[PDB]
Design a protein around this ligand. Sequence first.
Ligand SMILES: Nc1ncnc2c1ncn2[C@@H]1O[C@H](COP(=O)(O)OP(=O)(O)O)[C@@H](O)[C@H]1O
Ligand SMILES: Nc1ncnc2c1ncn2[C@@H]1O[C@H](COP(=O)(O)OP(=O)(O)O)[C@@H](O)[C@H]1O
Lengths: 70, 77, 185, 371, 371
Amino acid sequence: XXXXXXXXXXXXXXXXXXXXXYXXXXXXXXXXXXXXXXXXXXXXXXXXXXXXXXXXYXXXXXXXXXXXXX
Amino acid sequence: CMFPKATDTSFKNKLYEQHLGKSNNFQKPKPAKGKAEAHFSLVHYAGTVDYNIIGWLDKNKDPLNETVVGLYQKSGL
Amino acid sequence: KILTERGYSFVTTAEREIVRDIKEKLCYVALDFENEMATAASSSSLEKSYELPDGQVITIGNERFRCPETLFQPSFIGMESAGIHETTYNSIMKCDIDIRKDLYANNVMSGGTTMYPGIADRMQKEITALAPSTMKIKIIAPPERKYSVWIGGSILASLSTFQQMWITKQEYDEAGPSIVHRKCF
Amino acid sequence: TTALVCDNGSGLVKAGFAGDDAPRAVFPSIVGRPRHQGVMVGMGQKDSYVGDEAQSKRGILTLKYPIEHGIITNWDDMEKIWHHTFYNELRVAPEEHPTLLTEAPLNPKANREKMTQIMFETFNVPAMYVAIQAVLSLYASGRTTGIVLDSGDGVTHNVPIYEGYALPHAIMRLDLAGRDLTDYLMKILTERGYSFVTTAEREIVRDIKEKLCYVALDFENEMATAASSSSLEKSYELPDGQVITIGNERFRCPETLFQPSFIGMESAGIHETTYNSIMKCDIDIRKDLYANNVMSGGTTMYPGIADRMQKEITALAPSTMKIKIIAPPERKYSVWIGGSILASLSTFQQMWITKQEYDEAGPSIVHRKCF
Amino acid sequence: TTALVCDNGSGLVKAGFAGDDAPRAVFPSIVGRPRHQGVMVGMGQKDSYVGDEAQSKRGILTLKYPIEHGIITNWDDMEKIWHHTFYNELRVAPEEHPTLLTEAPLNPKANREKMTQIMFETFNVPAMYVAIQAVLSLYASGRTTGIVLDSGDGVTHNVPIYEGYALPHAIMRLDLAGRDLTDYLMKILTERGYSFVTTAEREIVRDIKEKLCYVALDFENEMATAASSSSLEKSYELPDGQVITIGNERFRCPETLFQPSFIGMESAGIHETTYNSIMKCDIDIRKDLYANNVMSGGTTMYPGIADRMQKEITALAPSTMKIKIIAPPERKYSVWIGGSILASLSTFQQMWITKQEYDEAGPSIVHRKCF
Ligand SMILES: Nc1ncnc2c1ncn2[C@@H]1O[C@H](COP(=O)(O)OP(=O)(O)O)[C@@H](O)[C@H]1O
Ligand SMILES: Nc1ncnc2c1ncn2[C@@H]1O[C@H](COP(=O)(O)OP(=O)(O)O)[C@@H](O)[C@H]1O
C-alpha cells in the first residue's frame, strides 16, 4: 500500500550487505593513483650498480694513473 | 552425437585412444593418394579398405515430434 | 505474512499449497523496484482478480511482484547472502580470470523459481550492473527447465560408460555405503 | 614523553607502549552494523559497532570485515576502529607519542599512502613508521639471520632475512590464511550437516579452531587410524545449545596448508614454497637457515606443525645436514613484542617520519624513506 | 627427398623444411594437465595437453614448463610434444628427412646425449645435427664475423663469432631471459595490486610484454617525465574482464637487463658483459665488432633497445671509433631461418650424423663430431 520503514530498512541493509559495491569503490578507485617516487630501493640499486662494474672500478685507477708512469 | 556443440575431432581422439592401440584389424590409414584426409583403415572379406570423415555425425540424428503427424492426422488428405 | 495485509488468512499445509497455484498464475518478475512502486501508486492493471480454488474471488496487488524480489533481497525473510546475482558474481570472482568470458556468454537457469516470466531480464540488468559492460553477456532460459533435470538424467542413462561406472550389488556386498563417496562424486 | 605502537596485523588488534611486556588489550577488527528496525524507542541508535562490544552485541548486528587478504578494505571504517581504540582503550591523544605501523610486506602502495595521509592529517602525531613483520619476528626471536613463516588472520608469508638485510626477490606472499580455511570448513561441515552460514556463525568456528584442531602427523596413517578409532573424535558443545562431535574433519583442515587443493590453487604449499624460495637464495647461507627456522602466529598455534614441517624438510633437504625449527610459546603476540623492541632503540629518532616532511612532501616520502 | 629442421629455441617452437621462407607453424612448448575431477562422463579424458589446443583449454589444465633456463626439464614430456608436433602439424614420419637440432651453447652434455639417443631410437631418422644459435644468426644476418645477443624465452647469450671460427672461451651465457623477468613483474604489479599468481596468469603477462613495453631512453630523465606526465601511462584491458592501466611499471621492466638488481644477481649486465667479453678477445679484431653488432629474438622485440645499447657503448667505447648495431625486423624467426640456410648446403651430407655411427658408437659420437 506504501513505501515504508520496512522497505527502507531493506534497502539500507542490502546496501550494507553488498560487499562488491563498497569494496570495489574503495579499492579499485584507489588502485589507479598508486605511485610516484624516485625510490630509495632504486637508490640501493644505483649504489650497488656503482659498486658493480669493472669499467668504473678498474678503469678509474688504471686509466688515470698509468697515464703517468715515469 | 548427443554430446553437443563439439567436433568429430573429439571422436577422432577417442578412436585413437580406444581402438587405435587395441583393435588389431582396424588401423590408422597410411598415406595414400586421391584424398585430403582418411581416418579409418580396417580389414574385410573383400580385402582391406580405408575410409574418411567429414563432420556428418548429426546427419544420422533422428528428431521426433508427435505433433507433426499428430495434427496431420486431422488434415483433409 | 504478506497476505494478512489484505487479511484473507489461513495457515495449514494444504492452505499453503493452495498458494502454489497462485505462484503459477499470478506471479511475474519486477523489472525495476522503485519504478514498479511508482506504477503501483498509479495503476491497478498491476492488480488482478483470482478465485479461490473454490469459494471467493481474490484480487492481489503488488503482493504478487514483491514476492520474487526476496530472491534479490532476502531481507523480507531476513538472512544475509547477497542474493542470487551477487552470489553468482561473487562465485565468479572466486573462479579464475580467463574462463570468465565464456560464462558471461553461457549462463543457464532452470526449474521452480525460474518459471516466472522476466527473471532472466532483470538478472541481465544486474550483471550489466556488476560486469564491466565492455564484454558480451547473455543468459539461457529454455522452455522446459522444470523437466530439465530428469531429461538430462535420461541422456545420462543412455551412454554405455555408466556400465563401466554403475555401482553393482557385488560391491555393496563386499564394502559398505562407504563405496559411494569414493566412487561417485 | 613516551612512544606507542599499533599492531595492525590482522585478527585481533594489538596496541601498547614501548617497554610494556604485552599490549594493554586487543580487538578483532570486526565491524558490524544493525540488521533490523530499531523498535525499542528507548534505545539509543548507534549505527556501527566494533570490538568485544560488538562481540557481545553480535546477533542483530551483521559483520563487515575491513581487511581482506591483509588488504584493508574500507578506510573510513578503519578510522572508526582506530579512533575508538585510542580513546576507549588507550585514553590517548594523537600528539602523545610516535606511532608505529605494522604491514604485510610486498603489497600495494595505496595502503602506505592513505594510511600515512590519514594518520598525519586526521590524527596529528609526532612521528610515524611502518614496519615489515619479519623484522619484528627476528628481533623478538633474537637471531639476526632467518626465515619466518607467519600465517595470521591475513596473507601468509615467507621471508628469509639475512642478518641486517632484505632479500625482497626471495620473498613469497600468500593468501592462504586461516579465515579462508575456516570458510572451507563449512563446506566440510555439511558432511555431518550441522550447517549455518553467516559471518558470526563463521567466527564461531574460530573457537573450534582454538580447541579442536591438531596437526596430522601422517595423512595415510591418520586415515588408517580414522578407520580404526574414535579417540580421533571428540565431543564439543555449541557455545550455547548442542553438543557437537567431530571426526577427521578436525585434522583434515590444516592439511590444506600442505595441500591447497581442498580449496584449490596451485602454490605447492608452505614447505615446498619455503624450499623453493631457499633454492632461489644462494648456496652458502643455506645451512644457517636449515638451523634457523622460525614460525609464528595464527596457524602455528596448532600443536604439531613444526614436526611435520621437519618431516617435510627431511624429505626435501639432503639429510646430511642439521635441521631444526623454532616454535616459541608466544608467537601470536610476537609481532607486537618485536615492535616494542623496535620502538625502544633511539635510531628511529634518526629514522621516524616527522610532520615536517609530510608538510614539505607527500605520502611519496614513505616509499623512499621506509622499506 | 627433402630435409626438415626443428627449432627448439625455447618459447614457441618452430619447424619447417629447407627452403621455405618461414616455418609452417609454431608452438609454445607449454605442457599442461587436468586439475579437477572429470565430471562430464561424456568427455574423453586426455591427461596431458600441449600447444594452442591447451592455450585454448588452459583454465582447468595446469602448466608444466619443460625447459628451465634453456635446459629441458623432463624428457618424456618432450617426447610427447615432439611426437605431437610431427604428426599433427607436420604429417611427417621420422624416416622422411634429416633433422636439425637447435641448442643453447655451452650447456650440459646430457641434453646432447639423451636428445640424440631418443631421436635415433624413438624416432628413426636419416640424419641428425645439433647447431649453436649464433652460427645461424650470422648466416641469416649474413656477416661472417660478429657478436650476437639473443635473449629468448631461454638463457641469454653473448657470443662473438669471427668469420669461420669459434672463440668458446670468449663466450658468455646468462639465465636472465624474459620469463624470469616476467615473474619479477608480478612483484612489481602488486604495487597497483591487481594480483594473481599461477602459470596461465603469468603467461597473460606475455601479451602485455608484446603490447605495453618500451625501452627506457634514460632512467633518471624518465623518472622526471614520470613525475610530469601520464602519456607514459597507457590503458589496457584484461584479455577479458577489466581495463588495466600501467605506469612506469612498463618501462622499469627492461632496465633489469641493464640492472639485474631488481631480481638481484651480479653480472654487470648485457652491455658491460659484452664489452667485458670483448676486452677478453684480442685487440685488432675489435673494430669490426664495433661495426658488426647483432641482436635477435625475444627481448630484442622491444622498441629502443639498440639505441640505449649504443648509448652504453658510446659510454664504454673510446668514442673515436665507429659504432653501430643491427636490429633486423625478423629477429624472433631469425634462428630457424638461418637453420634453413644451414640445411641447404650439401656439406652437411659430409657432416650429418648417420644411423650407422649411432649403431657403431654411442651418443659419445656427437661431442667429438659436432661442436
Ligand atoms: N586459539 C587459537 N588457535 C588457533 N588459531 C587461532 C587462535 N586464536 C586465533 N587464531 C587465529 O590466528 C589469527 C589471529 O590473527 P593474527 O595471527 O594476528 O593475524 P595477522 O598475522 O594478520 O596479525 C586468526 O587467523 C585467528 O583465527
Ligand atoms: N610480441 C612480443 N614482444 C616481446 N617479447 C615477446 C613477444 N612475443 C614473444 N616474446 C618473448 O620472446 C621469447 C620467445 O621465445 P624465443 O625468443 O624463441 O626464445 P629462445 O631464444 O629460447 O628460442 C619469450 O621470452 C617470449 O616471452
